[PDB]
Amino acid sequence: MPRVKLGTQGLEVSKLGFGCMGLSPEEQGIAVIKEAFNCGITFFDTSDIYGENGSNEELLGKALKQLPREKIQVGTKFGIHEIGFSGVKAKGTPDYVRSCCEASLKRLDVDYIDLFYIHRIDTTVPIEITMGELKKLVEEGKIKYVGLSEASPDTIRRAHAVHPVTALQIEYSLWTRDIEDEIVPLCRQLGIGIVPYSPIGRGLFWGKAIKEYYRIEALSQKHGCTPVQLALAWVLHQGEDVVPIPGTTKIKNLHNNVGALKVKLTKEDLKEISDAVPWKFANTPPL
Numbered sequence: 001m002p003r004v005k006l007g008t009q010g011l012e013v014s015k016l017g018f019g020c021m022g023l024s025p026e027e028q029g030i031a032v033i034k035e036a037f038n039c040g041i042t043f044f045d046t047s048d049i050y051g052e053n054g055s056n057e058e059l060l061g062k063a064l065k066q067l068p069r070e071k072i073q074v075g076t077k078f079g080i081h082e083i084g085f086s087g088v089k090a091k092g093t094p095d096y097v098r099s100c101c102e103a104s105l106k107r108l109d110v111d112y113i114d115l116f117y118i119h120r121i122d123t124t125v126p127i128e129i130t131m132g133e134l135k136k137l138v139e140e141g142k143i144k145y146v147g148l149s150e151a152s153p154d155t156i157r158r159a160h161a162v163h164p165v166t167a168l169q170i171e172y173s174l175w176t177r178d179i180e181d182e183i184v185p186l187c188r189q190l191g192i193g194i195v196p197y198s199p200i201g202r203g204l205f206w207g208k209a210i211k212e213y214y215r216i217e218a219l220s221q222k223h224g225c226t227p228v229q230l231a232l233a234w235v236l237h238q239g240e241d242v243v244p245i246p247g248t249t250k251i252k253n254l255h256n257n258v259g260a261l262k263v264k265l266t267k268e269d270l271k272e273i274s275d276a277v278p279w280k281f282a283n284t285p286p287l
């Protein structure tokens, strides 16, 4: 398991991270996390909003009790205040920041969070305000690093000016590449790590709909791996500063995901993959 510097403040994580969301039966859930660590994954992602009344955080904290905490990077988040019909409501008031952090510390049962993200941007509150409180939490040692999720470029530069952003969590995969145009260049110029969520889930949903593509399957075969491994490998190859956090509830798929690390792709391999996703009658359909 290769290790990489995420952002430029000293955070180090396993090149592949693990998304805890899906896990929210307890013993089974814990076992998956344990096995993830056995495979060398040390970077674990959750959020106060996952599961019911922060049960996903509570689950992770339980899991950490049979793991060496200081070998693990705990990523969690605050920001989503209530989900109703009208949509997602975000809150970024310093008080909320602080209250959310404390509640996460309690649920995870930890003295500190390695990477604490703003899950959703509060568009009624200047980013500098929310970042200011996080900056304080870094100084008190309650959190070590600061993350942003799905943030505007304006919001990214402004945040970073108050206190260095360690990571940006955003959707990125073969099926969603819109960060490439300006979000990626921007992160690299600021030295911010990139953390793709849904690096494979969107493709899986798509693949299943079509099977109810051949190009991609043909390429996975060419490279001696499964289609989901190809998709994941493609993400992994987008930079040393790129650390995806796929999740699973199945030990088998976890091992499959880890196996994606062995898939090695040349620049030409990669372009080929991107380009693909923008009885003398016994003839078959061409690719």
Ligand SMILES: Nc1ncnc2c1ncn2[C@@H]1O[C@H](COP(=O)(O)OP(=O)(O)O)[C@@H](O)[C@H]1OP(=O)(O)O
Residues within 6 Å of the ligand: 019, 022, 197, 198, 199, 200, 201, 202, 204, 228, 245, 246, 247, 248, 249, 250, 252, 253, 254, 256, 257
């Ligand atoms: N190796 C694999 N093969 C097929 N499906 C997988 C997989 N690894 C994860 N998934 C699925 O892909 C989904 C997660 O991908 P993400 O890319 O981690 O998801 P999301 O879109 O929710 O952010 C889950 O539905 C997960 O289902 P399982 O719990 O049944 O595994």
